[PDB]
Structure 1
Amino acid sequence: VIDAFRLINANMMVLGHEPRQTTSNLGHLNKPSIQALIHGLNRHYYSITINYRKNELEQKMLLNLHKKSWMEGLTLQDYSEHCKHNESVVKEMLELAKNYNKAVEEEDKMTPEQLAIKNVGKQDPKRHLEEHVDVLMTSNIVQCLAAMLDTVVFK
């Protein structure tokens, strides 16, 4: 949020130039400031419009956010830190699984209005088996490639 404003000669407005404070700006409409913009836009100031100038040198500068020549791919988490991770998740899989069977028996015997408003204990449904598998997998696959890649790279 960033606007711009310029006062307008309120005196000249009273004198008949009230429909004569219209400089030719484009437009795009505002509201929540209609508080003081109803005599702001239409008595005290008006709305200028904002732009930017996205240089290519500044853009190639900010674009930087990671120095990776020591980050991933030249590293990999600890292989005893990484089994303790799998352990936990793939057990949570079990807990959620059971509730998943209990949800597939319910949904069958109910109309979508009652499965719609079902927002008590979101732990039951698909949403958490997906939430998991995509972290688990991710991890691991790549978990996966990192080991292999280094075997040839630092061969």
Structure 2
Amino acid sequence: APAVDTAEQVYISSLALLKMLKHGRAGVPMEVMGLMLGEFVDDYTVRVIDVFAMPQSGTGVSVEAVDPVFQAKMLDMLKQTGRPEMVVGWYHSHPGFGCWLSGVDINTQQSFEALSERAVAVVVDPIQSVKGKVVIDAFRLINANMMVLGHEPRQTTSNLGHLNKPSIQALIHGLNRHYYSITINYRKNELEQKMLLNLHKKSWMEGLTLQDYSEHCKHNESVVKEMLELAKNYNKAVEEEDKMTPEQDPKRHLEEHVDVLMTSNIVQCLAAMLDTVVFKLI
């Protein structure tokens, strides 16, 4: 009997992640859900090419919350657009609950896996995904028969599935007992990276725009006053050092103050001088 490998990965597309995050935040504090489009490239790869949201329903996030008519028209009409991808799986946002499946979630996932054996049930936490960490996990299931007979839910052939550790929260809510966490990998090609880099690419202008000279002088005065006080603290600490065998330092704070003054002042001088040269009447 074939068993899904522990090296199986869910290649979440970049825009798939973006849409999931935006829709999850929009639904806060309610729970949202949507369908995940892509293709099962092989037994060790699930490529979530795209995702489309689903209308918020009074049921919540269940298998009655998937509108068959809405699902249909969206599927045929996206196929017309140029996205003829089979529905890979579904997603729903647990706002602040962490990533796991509640009993209704496993019920809906069973409904989904009735359609196809390979079908994931990724979830995302829209509020715990603060700047930096993104709290998203992908679980498929554990069939009861495989577990009760004692066989491990997934065969192992590599360390890929053991690189990351399952969390206590998910573990208590049935992880590794009713469903397994599938490692999530983000397909991000160079083009999308370069385009995303424009979000904080400032301009060709601020590289030549001088900071306000009055504000520059006030910042410099404040920093040199702080350097005063830090230097007095340094002198007192060093005077103590002599009456001290090996047994906040004014020195470090002084050092990063020096570094900030360095960068700000040198940049201002150099920028002003380039502005003198290139921005010339001639």
Structure 1 length-normalised TM: 0.72
Q: Deviations over 1:47-81 (max 9, x none)?
A: 32222211222112102134544632432122222
Contact 1:8 1:21 in 2 (8 A): no
Deviation at 1:130?
A: 0.8
Deviation at 1:16?
A: 5.8
Contact 1:8 1:43 in 2 (8 A): yes
Q: Could you tell me which of 184, 187, 190 is aligned with 1:53?
A: 187
Q: Deviations over 1:114-146 (max 9, x none)?
A: xxxxxxxxx652012112111111110111011
Contact 2:146 2:153 in 1 (8 A): no
Whole-angstrom CA distance in 2 between matches of 1:69 and 1:130: 31
Relative to total residues, which structure has the larger helix share, 1 or 2? Answer: 1
Cα 1:59–1:69, aligned 2, differ >3 Å: closer, same or farther?
closer
Count matched residues: 146
Contact 1:13 1:21 in 2 (8 A): no
Structure 2 length-normalised TM: 0.43
**CA RMSD of the aligned region, Å?**
3.3
Identity between Structure 1 and Structure 2 (%): 100
Contact 1:5 1:45 in 2 (8 A): yes
SS at match of 1:52: strand
Question: Structure 2: any 5+ residue segments left out of the alignment?
Answer: 1-134
Q: Deviations over 1:88-136 (max 9, x none)?
A: 22222222222211111112222444xxxxxxxxx65201211211111
The structure that has the greater radius of gyration is 1
Deviation at 1:33?
A: 3.8
Whole-angstrom CA distance in 2 between matches of 1:23 and 1:96: 58
Instruction: Identify which of structures 1 and 2 has the higher relative contact order when contacts are C-alpha pairs closer than 8 Å and 6+ apart.
Output: 1
Deviation at 1:2?
A: 2.7
